[PDB]
């Protein structure tokens, strides 16, 4: 089953049919006019952010043993992990780039739907997710609502309800208890047999689209192209 797509639903419709019951949806016609949609290119990103230091995750998946985190400039990240035939997967993941670079904040907008939350606009966390084709964020859940906005490229996204948590075999450790032990796209069904029958939603999220990921919904994300997404974590 595919995540439903709705064009600019009213605040009330979003609240009653999606936010309150905790059901995912893709919102169209909302972020398609961010300036970012037309302005953000590798060249623009280099011009505005190239000299700044960013954290970069190196390795296929953050659950891997060889996975690590390092620091480099945005120019270095683009050169080593996007443009030149990269040797390893690098991902500028989960970074508050817009607090670091306020000029880029002018190219985005917080969706009006976030004002249905009980939290302060000031406390919404805005993260950049910028990387090559093939980045993977393993199946995990977050403690706030999320609007994940796709700017450049496409992502394949799989969503499992919190009701299905048993079939997802969360890690026992404290660092990883919000992360599944299962590789979604190649699950070990001898070790994790309950995963096979667990229902899910999926989508390909394209530029200009917003995915609403309800609080605690399990999500898995693979970039299909050079990709730039912006998430808003809110309550
Ligand atoms: O985009 C990705 O790779 C992963 N995104 C998230 O987990 C998020 O926005 O919370
Ligand atoms: Mn997440």
Author numbering: 182 to 416
From the manuscript:
JMJD5 is a JmjC domain-containing protein, present in both the nucleus and the cytoplasm. Building from an extensive peptide-based screen for potential JMJD5 substrates, our results provide evidence that JMJD5 is a JmjC-hydroxylase, catalysing the stereoselective C-3 hydroxylation of arginyl residues in sequences from proteins involved in chromatin stability (RCCD1) and translation (RPS6). Consistent with previous reports, JMJD5 residues 174–416 fold into mixed helical and β-strand topology comprising seven α-helices, 13 β-strands and 3 310 helices. Like most 2OG-oxygenases, the JMJD5 active site contains a metal centre, which is octahedrally coordinated by an HXD..H motif (H321 and D323/βII, H400/βVII), the 2OG oxalyl group and a water molecule, which is likely replaced by a dioxygen during catalysis.
The lack of observed difference density (Fo−Fc) for the RPS6 peptides, excepting RPS6-R137, suggests that JMJD5 likely forms an unstable/less stable complex with the RPS6 fragment, possibly reflecting the relatively high Km value for RPS6 (60.4 μM). We therefore pursued a site-specific 'disulphide enzyme-substrate cross-linking' strategy, which enabled us to obtain four structures of JMJD5(Q275C).Mn.NOG.RPS6(A138C), JMJD5(N308C).Mn.NOG.RCCD1, JMJD5(N308C).Mn. OG.RCCD1 and JMJD5(W414C).Mn.NOG.RCCD1 as cross-linked complexes (Complexes 2–5, respectively). In these structures, clear electron density was observed for the substrate backbones that enabled modelling of residues other than the target arginine (RPS6 aa 137–138 and RCCD1 aa 139–142). Compared to Complex 1, single sidechain conformations for the target arginine residues corresponding to 'productive' (A in Complex 1) and 'non-productive' (B in Complex 1) orientations were observed in Complexes 3/4 and 2/5, respectively. The non-productive conformation as observed for both RPS6 and RCCD1 in JMJD5 Complexes 1/B, 2 and 5 (but not in ycfD or FIH) may reflect a substrate entry/product release route, though a role in binding one of the other arginine residues present in the substrate sequence at some stage in catalysis cannot be ruled out.
